[PDB]
Amino acid sequence: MNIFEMLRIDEGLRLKIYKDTEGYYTIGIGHLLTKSPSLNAAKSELDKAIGRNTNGVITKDEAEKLFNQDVDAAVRGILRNAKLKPVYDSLDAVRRAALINMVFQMGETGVAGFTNSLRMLQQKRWDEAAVNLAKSRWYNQTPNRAKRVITTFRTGTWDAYKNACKXX
Amino acid sequence: XXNXXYX
Numbered sequence: 485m486n487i488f489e490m491l492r493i494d495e496g497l498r499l500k501i502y503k504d505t506e507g508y509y510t511i512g513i514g515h516l517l518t519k520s521p522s523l524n525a526a527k528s529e530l531d532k533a534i535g536r537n538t539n540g541v542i543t544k545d546e547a548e549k550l551f552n553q554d555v556d557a558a559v560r561g562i563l564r565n566a567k568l569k570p571v572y573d574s575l576d577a578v579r580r581a582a583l584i585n586m587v588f589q590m591g592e593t594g595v596a597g598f599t600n601s602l603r604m605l606q607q608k609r610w611d612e613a614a615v616n617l618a619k620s621r622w623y624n625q626t627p628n629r630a631k632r633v634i635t636t637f638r639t640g641t642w643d644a645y646k647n648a649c650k651x652x
Numbered sequence: 653x654x655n656x657x658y659x
């Protein structure tokens with residue numbers, strides 16, 4: 485398991501424009517296109533992102549390319565942010581992935597706003613951090629995914645992302 | 653699923 489596999493599990497893969505959990509046009513492995521209610525606006529954003537006239541559909545390789553860019557964007561957002569960077573640097577590799585996951589979902593500014601959770605993570609007060617992280621619109625709106633990310637912070641293991649068949 | 657493995 486690693487951050488790419490973790491997010492692939494959490495986001496899925498769809499090759500045609502779809503709406504995310506908030507109703508926003510998205511494609512691929514959770515690539516947000518626009519918050520505009522206009523499908524034409526989303527299609528424009530898609531064509532710009534891919535570099536061709538896609539008519540709302542992409543290939544798996546194209547989806548993976550946007551995904552790789554989006555994971556980089558999350559990592560860069562953490563590394564440039566005065567609140568996120570020290571927390572990230574203080575964490576082990578597994579918990580670093582959990583933080584990247586949150587930033588991928590909610591953005592740099594969004595996660596930097598979790599002030600009390602971030603402090604508990606820096607303090608390595610894992611059960612307390614996990615309790616605090618769940619007191620959030622994030623948790624209430626996407627509880628299964630938030631539970632997996634929170635378990636990863638609580639335990640520093642990949643257990644929430646394992647299954648009996650070892651894939652599927 | 654819909655993905656593969658193995659983990």
Ligand SMILES: *[C@@H]1O[C@H](CO)[C@@H](O)[C@H](O)[C@H]1O
Nearest residue numbers: 651652654655656657658
């Ligand atoms: C594992 O995945 C392969 C590849 O599609 C499939 O052929 C098998 O049925 C499955 O066990």
Ligand SMILES: [Cl-]
Nearest residue numbers: 626627628629
């Ligand atoms: Cl969820």
